[PDB]
Design a protein around this ligand. Sequence first.
Ligand code: HEM
Ligand code: HEM
Ligand SMILES: Cc1cc(N)nc(CCNC(=O)c2ccc(C#N)cc2)c1
Ligand SMILES: Cc1cc(N)nc(CCNC(=O)c2ccc(C#N)cc2)c1
Ligand SMILES: CCCCCCCCO[C@@H]1O[C@H](CO)[C@@H](O)[C@H](O)[C@H]1O
Ligand SMILES: CCCCCCCCO[C@@H]1O[C@H](CO)[C@@H](O)[C@H](O)[C@H]1O
Ligand SMILES: C[C@H](O)[C@H](O)[C@@H]1CNc2nc(N)[nH]c(=O)c2N1
Ligand SMILES: C[C@H](O)[C@H](O)[C@@H]1CNc2nc(N)[nH]c(=O)c2N1
Lengths: 415, 415
Amino acid sequence: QYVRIKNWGSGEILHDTLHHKATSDFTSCLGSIMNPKSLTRGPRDKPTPLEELLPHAIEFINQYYGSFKEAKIEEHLARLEAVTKEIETTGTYQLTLDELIFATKMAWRNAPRCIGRIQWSNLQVFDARNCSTAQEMFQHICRHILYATNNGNIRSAITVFPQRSDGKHDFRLWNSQLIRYAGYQMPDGTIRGDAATLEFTQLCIDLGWKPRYGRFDVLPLVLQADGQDPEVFEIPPDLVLEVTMEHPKYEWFQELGLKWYALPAVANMLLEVGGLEFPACPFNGWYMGTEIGVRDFCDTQRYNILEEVGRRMGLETHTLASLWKDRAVTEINVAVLHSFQKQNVTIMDHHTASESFMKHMQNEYRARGGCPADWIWLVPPVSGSITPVFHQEMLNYVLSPFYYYQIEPWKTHIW
Amino acid sequence: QYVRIKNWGSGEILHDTLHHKATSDFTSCLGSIMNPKSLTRGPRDKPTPLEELLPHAIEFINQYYGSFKEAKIEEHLARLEAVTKEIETTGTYQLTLDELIFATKMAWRNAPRCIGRIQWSNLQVFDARNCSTAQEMFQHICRHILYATNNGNIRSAITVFPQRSDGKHDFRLWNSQLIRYAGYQMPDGTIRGDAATLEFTQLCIDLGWKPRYGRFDVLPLVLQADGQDPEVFEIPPDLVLEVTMEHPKYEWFQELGLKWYALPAVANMLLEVGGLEFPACPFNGWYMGTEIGVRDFCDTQRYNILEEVGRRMGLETHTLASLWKDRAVTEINVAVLHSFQKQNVTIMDHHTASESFMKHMQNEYRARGGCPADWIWLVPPVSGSITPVFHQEMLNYVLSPFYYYQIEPWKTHIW
Ligand code: HEM
Ligand code: HEM
Ligand SMILES: Cc1cc(N)nc(CCNC(=O)c2ccc(C#N)cc2)c1
Ligand SMILES: Cc1cc(N)nc(CCNC(=O)c2ccc(C#N)cc2)c1
Ligand SMILES: CCCCCCCCO[C@@H]1O[C@H](CO)[C@@H](O)[C@H](O)[C@H]1O
Ligand SMILES: CCCCCCCCO[C@@H]1O[C@H](CO)[C@@H](O)[C@H](O)[C@H]1O
Ligand SMILES: C[C@H](O)[C@H](O)[C@@H]1CNc2nc(N)[nH]c(=O)c2N1
Ligand SMILES: C[C@H](O)[C@H](O)[C@@H]1CNc2nc(N)[nH]c(=O)c2N1
């Protein structure tokens, strides 16, 4: 009847009906959409019909075995035999640890919205498929946070929890990312901290968590093990490394009293592989300066520090054409890189990150004739055409294994 | 067999085969492509089969008549009657000047890649459908350039030449835009002027034009009237207004000896309306600072002045993470705006241009429940997320009337 369109800044919604008057099918491109059903993998009620699972399974195993320089046909056939049997006999199956490792890196390799993929082959895999209690999830997450942080010398890693079985027993981290600050709706009407985590900070309060009403309070882990309700777990502060923000030249910058955590880790995505799907598999890499400097600090709906920095710099923050916003955001980006470097915490500026991806993309084409890429996500939020990825045409398709989005757990899980 | 992908900076080509392994049809999005066949309207050999023309014709006339606050049903029916007859009798038809005016503004209104559409209702239409000789095209173009320039107080306008009839008699401007600088492959191997117009500067040489081997030589008009070969016409220098570039603070900026023309006008697009298609209809608006400051001056494959400005600013142009590129490009953008303002030539910075489009887009939805928009083109080449359009989801569809691309005339026209 109409397409639903959203403004992730104002939150405002629009319904598009005009597209019904569109001309002959061309190249209604839903590419500007944040969460298209196309990139989402929702709930379940029954195991994956064997008719579909076996095909994918065979497919994956052939891919896995086809990945060797010198094939192991003997083992390959045998493995196909073994897996079929395991499915006839159990209605599902288990991946060898190596297959899991291979799946996670391949899934990463197939993330069209990830610019750090030249690092794809370098990933640490924590096998927690045997986990069974929330508390165990918590301990696993902590090991992950500790390992990945590596005292500032950030390391990429992923913790794979138990694969979805019947659909009624899914392991799910309710948080969007492992580490994230809380957002509060102060009594004086103002909002403190991360305006983006307002609702989730509430869900946390509602589950017991005690709010500290700070500007930078690390939210708690809200974990649901097996299929049971989510248990709240506060993260051990010693495990959260942070960088206090200061400018290489503006001494007043630290006066802003800003800081940010060093670990960027996705907590709410599902890993689909050869028919099996893991609804809980947090993973992490290291930051790209613009994420913090531009999105986290300058988005209207986040910490929105632009005007404050503008004034401090003595810019004409009242005349848009003065381009004061372009001057401020850049100084902020400089602060972020400078601070991470100074405190020896791994980080990469967007310019070298982009050249990095270009090299990767070229490697990918030679290697396998392609690289699924989402231009809209790969092009940095600032200095777009100054970056090489901006001038590159890209094809965006969903391969497999893959990291899908999921329906927010508090929308489908029943207490 | 494989999709062809291009890098508009390096010119390099890639063939994508991997997409054949893509999963169930989701939302292979060809949205990052510059010229998709979807946005192109090529040549012809025979008139538009009456079976197709009449439908569109009726459609357009209904749209046109439906556009009034207080309908003119009497006239509407009559017009439908009259048009059908004209097609049965002549196999095509003529739009009333008002319909043409309405079509051009609507076509503009439907340009998904245009950020200046809040201005859509404000357009001057020059009716040159009666033109018949190249020389007449030339005189018409000049009137257009003169009118639009209006001594710096830029005015939007379009000159509609004769609509395509049989397909073998098309009016076509061979240039991409009315005003554009030449590019030369100097004897010492270096390239002078606009590296992007190298080939076209050659086609011009080949057709007689005498090269001035300058950094800013305005190319000549290469016009093909009726269906005949293209005649070369040099633009009267008095008609080309330019802005010499200088910085509000860096006195050395003018030492760079930079300047740019004030008129941005598209010359190679086709206007499709109610079944009729005009292969020649140059139109213009006024500049958005980033076009010149970022694309024209800083693209590698254009004037590529970034490193030079970096050094002048005394930046660490050898350490990418210093973000010197972000500092330089901004100063350049400042020079562009400053210079146009100083010399009283209309121009708009990208920040106010974006808010402008947001207001327009919101007006469009209320007005007609939609606004075809191409996020990839609408988001400025610098400071993307600092702009409101970056956070807006958009639907990109091809309505009608519409401005399509065409196959470069020197590829299909036969001498
Ligand atoms: C090693 C350094 C890495 C860097 C610099 C990097 C950088 C980025 C950046 C800049 C984004 C944009 C995020 C946003 O705008 O919200 C992103 C998205 C993403 N990254 Fe990477 N990444 C890295 C490692 C990883 C790893 C190890 C994985 C998986 C195992 C991965 C999976 C993804 C996925 C799936 C997305 C999409 C997130 C979403 O759609 O919300 N990345 N990454
Ligand atoms: C009045 C001020 C105007 C402004 C500021 C404006 C601005 C822009 C900008 C920034 C672009 C990007 C061009 C590029 O990156 O190559 C663009 C594209 C475009 N504009 Fe507008 N425009 C204006 C008027 C017009 C008018 C009067 C028309 C038509 C009658 C129009 C039709 C288009 C079309 C069709 C494109 C697509 C060009 C392409 O695909 O190569 N614009 N405009
Ligand atoms: C693996 C990884 C590496 C990296 N370098 N960055 C990310 C991004 C994870 N997402 C977020 O940090 C995030 C997304 C949206 C909002 C909002 N609003 C806030 C944070 C993942
Ligand atoms: C109506 C209009 C208004 C406006 N403000 N800008 C334009 C853009 C026209 N295109 C170009 O100027 C151009 C495109 C590509 C290259 C290259 N390479 C160089 C110039 C049109
Ligand atoms: C219905 C299931 C049919 C399975 C047929 C599997 C045939 C073996 O497949 C082979 O595996 C090798 C690696 O072991 C690869 O190197 C070969 O390219 C591939 O053809
Ligand atoms: C096969 C061709 C059928 C044409 C039917 C035309 C019916 C008239 O169409 C009417 O035109 C008015 C404006 O004049 C609009 O305001 C009305 O909404 C529209 O229904
Ligand atoms: C609506 C639009 O798609 C959205 O706001 C953008 C675009 N590109 C992005 N790119 C990255 N890397 N991260 C993002 O959050 C977004 N969001
Ligand atoms: C490959 C990519 O689509 C291309 O280089 C870009 C993207 N967005 C753009 N947007 C505008 N306004 N103008 C452009 O030329 C381009 N080109």
